[PDB]
């Protein structure tokens with residue numbers, strides 16, 4: 001044993017930090033180039049803005065790539081991994097769209113290029129820039145997304161927005177809550193699986209085999225949960241009030257449906 | 266005295282690293298929103314691509330903001346320094362345009378958001394991300410630009426592309442050559458001032474008072490020259506061959522006109 005800070009955890013506890021990920025399905029049609037649903041962005045932004053005020057300096061917003069990200073990956077040449085570099089430009093545009101919208105309603109939203117801040121080493125993302133922590137400490141809202149990241153051999157890899165919360169794990173103090181908003185109510189097994197134990201999540205993986213994206217979400221959120229995070233897969237809706245995401249899980253409204261991924265506590 | 270590596274320097278010596286800055290005047294009309302001269306970008310890119318091959322892993326390309334940067338600064342609200350955040354999005358677009366063009370002709374060009382990598386402390390830019398060095402070591406071409414940078418108080422400042430070479434100073438080993446391509450042949454005093462000693466450049470500053478942008482260039486290049494760099498202000502032209510920028514200054518073609526800023530050596 002090495003010593004570390006004992007962190008109180010449980011469904012009774014308020015999160016110290018929110019990582020909110022908004023799936024591309026919710027504001028973009030992959031098979032419509034450059035599509036962004038401005039109404040969806042507008043409405044989500046209003047709900048994200050209220051979270052950001054409470055979680056000032058204690059939140060990130062992570063955007064899915066939508067048409068932009070999936071186009072960049074579709075149009076690259078796999079014989080030259082460097083052609084993936086266009087993905088960094090694609091996912092910058094989506095971050096811009098969120099940040100512009102949020103600033104328009106008074107949120108101090110700043111887009112940050114994950115590729116300028118993070119690289120891969122033995123497959124694990126490494127935060128390599130101090131700027132993310134600074135931005136948070138200034139009380140601003142980082143707008144993040146997936147990206148094309150370099151590995152230690154100079155090879156670019158597509159790193160999904162779904163995995164971005166992994167990057168926060170060494171940086172966040174206290175209780176991290178990760179919320180992945182998608183176009184389904186959770187992991188469907190048909191019923192939702194309401195609880196997954198990240199120590200042994202084999203039944204959640206077995207459910208995706210039943211129903212064939214979601215694998216990547218599960219992988220990322222298990223990884224996060226094994227490092228103490230309280231993670232959720234749940235349905236996004238542009239107009240839905242998200243104030244409950246500030247609250248202890250045991251206090252959530254009864255109508256809310258999700259898959260909750262944790263280790264004991 | 267503290268010891269340090271003795272670096273051979275002089276007009277007889279080949280540069281170890283090239284920082285090439287392309288002024289917005291050369292490819293963009295400030296007062297035409299979103300203007301980018303695609304032909305100018307195309308032609309410059311072909312000439313930059315030859316430098317990047319020789320200087321593989323030993324060069325950065327820095328873009329002026331043009332219409333994009335100056336629009337963002339024009340349209341921000343000075344009563345809320347955070348509205349400058351749109352400048353980061355503006356100068357990302359210009360980096361994208363260069364990097365797309367360069368990749369199209371086989372250069373491993375990758376845009377990097379300076380704001381994600383650098384902050385200001387007591388007015389001095391601080392490189393805060395290890396990713397720039399990595400990208401270079403991978404043999405890629407960073408595409409840089411000016412940006413909105415945070416200070417230590419959380420205030421955003423417009424940091425010109427002209428100042429970006431300053432950020433390289435602690436990072437570059439060996440002889441850095443900085444080349445600022447603009448729409449004039451150098452500092453006009455009318456004749457060009459061919460040599461400026463960065464230790465006491467008072468006559469170059471006196472010339473700008475004669476002729477009223479250029480002040481910022483001089484400040485940045487003096488700063489760089491005082492830390493060993495060999496710096497140039499010279500006229501850019503999309504079709505002009507730049508191969509001479511790989512060569513010792515004493516070997517440059519006789520037709521080339523510039524203002525050279527150095528300390529002794």
Ligand SMILES: Nc1ncnc2c1ncn2[C@@H]1O[C@H](COP(=O)(O)OP(=O)(O)OP(=O)(O)O)[C@@H](O)[C@H]1O
Pocket residue numbers: 022023024025026030064065066067181182183184186187188189207208211212213214215
């Ligand atoms: N067991 C499962 N339960 C729920 N969804 C599942 C399951 N297995 C696979 N999925 C699929 O995963 C999808 C969610 O992942 P997906 O990557 O499509 O969404 P997103 O990231 O929100 O948006 P985008 O479509 O732009 O990537 C669901 O729509 C569903 O089709």
Ligand SMILES: Nc1ncnc2c1ncn2[C@@H]1O[C@H](COP(=O)(O)OP(=O)(O)OP(=O)(O)O)[C@@H](O)[C@H]1O
Pocket residue numbers: 287288289290291295329330331332446447448449451452453454472473476477478479480
């Ligand atoms: N003594 C001087 N010698 C030469 N140019 C000078 C002098 N004093 C002021 N200048 C001005 O500085 C200009 C170059 O700086 P400027 O910022 O306009 O160019 P740029 O960065 O290349 O492009 P952009 O116009 O988009 O910023 C010249 O066109 C000139 O008008």
Ligand SMILES: C[C@@H]1O[C@@H]1P(=O)(O)O
Pocket residue numbers: 024063064065066068069070091145146147158159160161162
């Ligand atoms: C990184 C690529 O845009 C996709 P995702 O982030 O939605 O998985």
Ligand SMILES: C[C@@H]1O[C@@H]1P(=O)(O)O
Pocket residue numbers: 289328329330331333334335356410411412423424425426427
């Ligand atoms: C940073 C603002 O775009 C301008 P410049 O980089 O051309 O000075």
